[PDB]
Amino acid sequence: NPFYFRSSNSFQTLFENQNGRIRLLQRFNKRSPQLENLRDYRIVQFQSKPNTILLPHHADADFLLFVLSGRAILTLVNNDDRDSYNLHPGDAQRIPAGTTYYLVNPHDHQNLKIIKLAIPVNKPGRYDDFFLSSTQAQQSYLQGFSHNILETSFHSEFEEINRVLFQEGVIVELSKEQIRQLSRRAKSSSRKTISSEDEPFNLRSRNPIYSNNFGKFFEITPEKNPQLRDLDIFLSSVDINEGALLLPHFNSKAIVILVINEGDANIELVGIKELEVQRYRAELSEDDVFVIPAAYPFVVNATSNLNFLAFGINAENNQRNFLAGEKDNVVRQIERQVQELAFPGSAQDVERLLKKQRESYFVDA
Amino acid sequence: NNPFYFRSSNSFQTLFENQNGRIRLLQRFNKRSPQLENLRDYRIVQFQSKPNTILLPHHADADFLLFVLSGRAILTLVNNDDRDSYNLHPGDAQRIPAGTTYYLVNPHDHQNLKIIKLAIPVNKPGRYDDFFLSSTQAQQSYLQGFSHNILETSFHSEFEEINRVLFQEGVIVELSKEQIRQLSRRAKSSSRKTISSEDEPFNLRSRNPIYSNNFGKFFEITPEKNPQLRDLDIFLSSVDINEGALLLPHFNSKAIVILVINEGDANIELVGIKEQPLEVQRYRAELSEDDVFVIPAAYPFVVNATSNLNFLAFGINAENNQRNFLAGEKDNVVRQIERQVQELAFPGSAQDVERLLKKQRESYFVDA
Amino acid sequence: VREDENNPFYFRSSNSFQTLFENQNGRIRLLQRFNKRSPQLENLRDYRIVQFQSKPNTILLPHHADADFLLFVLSGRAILTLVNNDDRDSYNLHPGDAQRIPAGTTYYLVNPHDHQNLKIIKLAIPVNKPGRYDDFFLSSTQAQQSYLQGFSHNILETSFHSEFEEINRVLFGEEEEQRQQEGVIVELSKEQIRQLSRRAKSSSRKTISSEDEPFNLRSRNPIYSNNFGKFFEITPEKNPQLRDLDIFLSSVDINEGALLLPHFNSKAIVILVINEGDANIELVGIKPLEVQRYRAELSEDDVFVIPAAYPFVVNATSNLNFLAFGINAENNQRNFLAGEKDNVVRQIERQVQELAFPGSAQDVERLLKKQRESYFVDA
Question: Where does the record place the Cupin type-1 domain (chain A)?
Answer without folding.
Answer: 3-162, 201-351
